[PDB]
Amino acid sequence: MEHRAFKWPQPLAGNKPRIWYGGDYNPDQWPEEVWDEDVALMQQAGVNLVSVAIFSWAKLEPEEGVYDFDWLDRVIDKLGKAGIAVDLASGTASPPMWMTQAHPEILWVDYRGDVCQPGARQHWRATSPVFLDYALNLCRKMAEHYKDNPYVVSWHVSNEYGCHNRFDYSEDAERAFQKWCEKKYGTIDAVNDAWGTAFWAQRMNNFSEIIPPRFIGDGNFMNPGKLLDWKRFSSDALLDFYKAERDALLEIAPKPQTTNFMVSAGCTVLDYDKWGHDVDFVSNDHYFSPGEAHFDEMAYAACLTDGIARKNPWFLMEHSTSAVNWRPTNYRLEPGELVRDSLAHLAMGADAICYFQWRQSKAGAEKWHSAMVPHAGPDSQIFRDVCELGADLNKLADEGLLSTKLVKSKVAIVFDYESQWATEHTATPTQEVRHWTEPLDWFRALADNGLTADVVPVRGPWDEYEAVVLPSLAILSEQTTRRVREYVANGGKLFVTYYTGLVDDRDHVWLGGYPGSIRDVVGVRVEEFAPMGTDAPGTMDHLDLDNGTVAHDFADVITSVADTAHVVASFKADKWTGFDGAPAITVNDFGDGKAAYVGARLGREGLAKSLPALLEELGIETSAEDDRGEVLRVERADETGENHFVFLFNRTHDVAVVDVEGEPLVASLAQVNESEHTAAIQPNGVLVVKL
C-alpha cells in the first residue's frame, strides 16, 4: 500500500506561499451584488482561498445535458482578480431533483428496504452504475471548462463521502458485496471459515448466498464477521467511487486534489488511514466536542490527522467559528476559542485553515450553523476574530512556519478504524466498551503528565517510537502481533490495556487465555472478563485499585503473572467478588523491552494518576515541574531545526504561567513579560514562540 506523491495547492502567479485561509463559499445562495461585498470582506479578513461549487449540481447542470457555468466563471474571476485562490469542487456531492426523479434507482436503500428520498443531501448509492455515469460526466465537463483557469489551484472531490450514504442495502450493494468478498477471499469456503458459518446454519454453497446484513428483527444478533466485512466493503465501495471521480478530473485537468475527511476521536465511518493513501494531500473536517473535552479532543483529532498524513503538512478544510446546527444542543464557542481552535490545528501540522462557511445561510437546513460572516454581519465579534486570525496566519508564514512538521513524540498511541468496527458488534462483553475512547483517554492522561503523544494509525510507523500504547486495540492480526512482539523484544516500551488483542482480523478469538497472541509479551493470562455497570440493583459498578484509582465498566480476571513480571497495582474489593488482591496493573520484562498491562478501564483521571509509576518503570522521562499538565506543548520544526516553533495552550480554567524560550510571535488571551521572560495564559489562551 503506497501513498500518492504529495502535492499541495500552489500560489496564484505572482503570490508567495501562505498558510491558506478561508472557507466554503456559496455565492449561488445569494444575489450577485452580495458577491462584490464578499470579496471586499475577504480581503479585509486576509482570506486567500475559498472552496466553491460543492453542492452546486442543480445550478451547474439545471436539466440533463444542459450546462450553465457562466455564474461560476464570473465569481471565480472576481475572486482571482482580488488575489483569492479557488479550491474548486467537482460539484458531484449531491444530485439534483431532475436526476433522482428520472432515476429512482440512484437512491440508497436502508436495512429494512426503505428508500432514502431527496430533501437533504448525498442520497445516492456508492455502487450505482447510473449515478457513477452522471458524476463522471459532470467531473469531465468541470475539468474541461476549468483546465486552464489561472485561479483554480486545487480540486475538492465530492464532499465527506459516507457521512450519509455509508450503508446501502440495495440490489446494487448486494451484487457489489458478493464481488468484494470473492475478490478478498477467493473461495466461498474461505468466506464460510472467516465468518464462522457452521454456527446457526449459515454455511453458503456459493457467492450468490452472500447477502447484506439487512433487517433480522431488532435486537437479534447479526453474523459478526459479516458485519465487520460489511463496514470494510462500505468504506471500499466509496473509495472506489472517489478514485474514479479523481481520475476523471485528473485525466483532463491535473491539479492537486483531495477529498475532505471527518477525522475525530469518535468518527469511524471510513477507514480514513486507508483513504489517506489516495489523496494528494490530507484534508479534514473537525468540529468541537462540547464541554470539558473540547480542547483535548480537538488536539487529539488534529494529531491523528497528522498521523494519517505521515507527518506531511495537511489541510483543515472545515471547522466552525462558533455553534454548529446538527447537535441536539448547539453550544457556542467562548471568547478566544475561535483563534485558539484554529491555532490548535495549525500546531498539529496544518498549513491551511478553513471554515464551513464564509457567509451564514439565511435559509435551509444549516441556517443556524455559524460562519465567518454571521447573520449579524461584519460588525460582529466573530468577524473581528476572523480578521485577527487572518493577520496571525500571515505573521506565522512570514516567520517560516510553512512546511515545518509536527515533531516526533516519545509516545505513539495506536488507532485502528477496524478495531473500532469490531467493538461495535451487539454481542460483545459490553456495549459500554468501544475502541475509540481508550486512545483519547491516554492522550489526555499523558498530557496531564507533561507529555504530548503522537497518534499513529496501526498501519503507520508506531514501532519506530520510544514507547507505544495499544488502547483497547481489539484486533491484533498475525502481522500486528509480530510487529508488537518484535518491537518489545528489541527494547521497545509498550502499554497494553483491557480489550486489546481479543481477536484476529477475521474476528476469530485468539484462544488459550487473553490476550491470546501476546500473553507472553505482557506476562499475564486473562481467563475471563468482569464487565461492570448499573443496569439492575446490586450490579458490580466499580473496582477500587490500591494505587488510589477506581475502575469502571470493565476489568480483566488475571489468573497468572509471569516470573518476569510484577504487579504494580491490585484491586481491592468485597471478598465474594473474587477481585480482592487480584492483579490490576502489571509490568513485564520481555527481551530487552518492557510491557505494562492495564487490566481495567481507569478513565482519563485513573490513567493520569497511574502513569507516574508506569512512566518511571518504563524509563520514559517527563518534566519534574508540578504544573506540567496545565498546558499542552505542541512543536513544529523543519528538518534542519533552523525554524522551530512552540505552541502553548492552556488546558485549564486557571491562569497558567509559562517560560518564554524564544521570540513571541502570536498571543491570544496571553500576556508576555519581557523582563522575566514569562507569560500568563488566560483560560482559552495560547502563545506561539519561535526558538
Add this chain to the structure above:
Amino acid sequence: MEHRAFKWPQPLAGNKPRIWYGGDYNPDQWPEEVWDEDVALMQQAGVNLVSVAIFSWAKLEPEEGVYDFDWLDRVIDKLGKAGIAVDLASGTASPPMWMTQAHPEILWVDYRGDVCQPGARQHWRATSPVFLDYALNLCRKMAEHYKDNPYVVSWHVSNEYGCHNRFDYSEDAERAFQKWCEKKYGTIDAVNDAWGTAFWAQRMNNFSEIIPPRFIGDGNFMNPGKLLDWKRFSSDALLDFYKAERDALLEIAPKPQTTNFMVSAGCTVLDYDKWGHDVDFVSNDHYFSPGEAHFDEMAYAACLTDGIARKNPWFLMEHSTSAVNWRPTNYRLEPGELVRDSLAHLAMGADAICYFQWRQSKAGAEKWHSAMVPHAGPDSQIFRDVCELGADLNKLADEGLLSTKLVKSKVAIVFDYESQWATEHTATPTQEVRHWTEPLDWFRALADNGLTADVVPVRGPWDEYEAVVLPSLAILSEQTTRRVREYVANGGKLFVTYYTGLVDDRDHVWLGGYPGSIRDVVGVRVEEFAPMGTDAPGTMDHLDLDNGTVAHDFADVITSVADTAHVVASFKADKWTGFDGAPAITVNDFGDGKAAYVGARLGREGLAKSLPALLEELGIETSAEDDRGEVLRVERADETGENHFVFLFNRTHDVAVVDVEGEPLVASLAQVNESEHTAAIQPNGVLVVKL
C-alpha cells in the same frame, strides 16, 4: 387438557441411572481432531449426555434433497463408545441459506410488512406450509437414520420456539389467525363481542375482516382483545408446529422427547404451562438475572419450572457457566456461583443439569458466550468447577436423589401467562405494572420470612394448598373465580393484590367495583386506581403506610370494607390526596377461610415487612428464628420419605450459620463442624444434607 405420559431419557445399555450432566455440543464448528479431545475432557468432567445437531441443517442437508450424515454418525459413535449419551436434535431449528434463497415465502414478516432476513437464526414463519414440509422431511430423514442407534436416548425437537419468530404478520399468519378465531369462537358475532368491536367502528361482517394487529401508527392503541388473542394464537401456532415435528419423529423413531422452554420470571413468549402438556418431560433454559436478584429469581424460575412439570422431575437443558453474550453488559458469575446455580435447579427438582455450551465458539455471534471449555481451555477455573460439579452430581445420585420430588410448600404463588399478556396493553392504568413482577416479589418476601413457596401455574392444583397468592393476577375467568370463591369458603387462606381480577379471559372488565368477580371474598370495594410515578414535576410518587412500609407505582382507592373484614394497615398522606387514613391492607372472613387484600405495590421489602402480621392473621406458621430469611431451604423427598434431601443456600453477603440435621453430602463455600453439628455458609455457598 391431559398431560402426556411422563417419559425420561434412559441410560445407555450397561449404565446405571445418573443425574444427566453435559451441554449443547457443536462438533461441526471444529476440525475433527478436536472431537477426540472433547470426548477425553467430557470423561474428566463426568459429562454423561450432550445435545447435538441443534443448528446443523446446513451440514445435514447441504443442498435440497442431499443428506450428509456421516460426520454425525462418527461423532455419535465416539461419544457412545466413551459412555456418553446423545440427546439428538431434529436439526430443524433454523433453515439453510439455499432454502430461504429458493423460498423467500418462508421468512417471517414484521408488523410494518418488513421481511426478516437470514443472518441470525429462526427466521421462519410458524404458519408457512412450505417450511413445515421442509422441517417434517428432515425430521423423517433423521428419525429413519437414527431409529436403531444405541447411543441416542432422546429427541431435542427444534430449539426455543418463538425466541425470535413468536410474531409473524405475513399472509400465512393472516389466514391462520382467521381460522384460529373461527375455531375458538364459532361465529363472527362472538368475535365482535369478545373484542368489543362496537367501539371505534371495528365491527366485522365475516371472518375475512379479521386482520393481524399490524402497524397502526406508533403510539396508537390496538384493539386489546385482538392483541390478547394474537398472543394466544402465536403461541398455539408454534405449538401446532412443535406437535407436527414431534409426531413425525415419533412415528419412525419413538424415544423420549422434549422441546426446550425459556421459563424465567419475566419471559412469557409462549404459554409454557400449556406447552408442558405436549412434552414427554419438561426441559428449561434459564440464564441468571444480573445483580441482587440473581439467586432468588433463578430459584423462583426453577420453582415455576417444577410447577409446570406438576412436580415430576424436569431437565435443565441450558444455563451458563459464566457470562452470556446477549445483554448490553454481560456480567460474569462470581466464585462458587457455577456450582451453586446448578444445585439451585437441582434442588427445585431437576434430574439433569446441562449448559449452553460444551466448547466456547471462537467465531460467530455467540463467541463471547461462556462455555464449559472456555476460550482459555481446560486450564481454567471454569473447567475445574465443571469437573467438581460433575463429581458432586455423581455423589448425589449414589445417595438416592434421582426421582425424588420437590416437597409441597404451605404456599402456592399463582402464575398466569395470559394475565401477563393482558397487562401488556398500552392503554392500561399504568405501563409500570405488569403481572410478572408481583409473584416474584412474593416469592422473595416469603423467603425473607422463612418460607419457600411453590410457584403454581393457574391451571395447576393451587387450590390444594394451605395458602394461595393471587399476585397482580389481572385475569379471573368465570372458572378461576369459582375456584377462588370455593377455595376460601371451604377454609383456604388467600392473599390478593392490586391489579387482580380486573377482567375476564376476554379482557372485559368485571363491573360494580374492583375486583369485580370476588369483591365479597376480599371484603373490599375499589372504585378507582391511583397510579404513581415521577413523569412530571409534582406527580404523586409514593404513599406511606402506617405499618412502616411505602407504596410505589400503584394504589387502590378502597371505598368500603365488609363487616366481616378489618383494616390491618392504612395509608398516611397529605389530606388533599384523599388517601390519609384510607385502607391499604385488609383481612376478611369468608366462609371458613380468610382473604387478605394488599391494595398497593409494596415491593419485596414492603411485603417482607408486612407479612409477619398477615401470616399470623391467616394462621400460617413459620420459624421463630431471627435469621430465618438468611438461607433458602429447599427440600426433595421420595414418596415414602426414606430419601429426604435438604439444600441450604445463602441468600446474603454475610456468613450464614445453620444446623446440620443429617449427613452432609455436598458443600460449596461451606464448612461443617461435626462437633457442634453446624455449618458456616459463605456468600454464594450451599450445603446439601440427607436426613
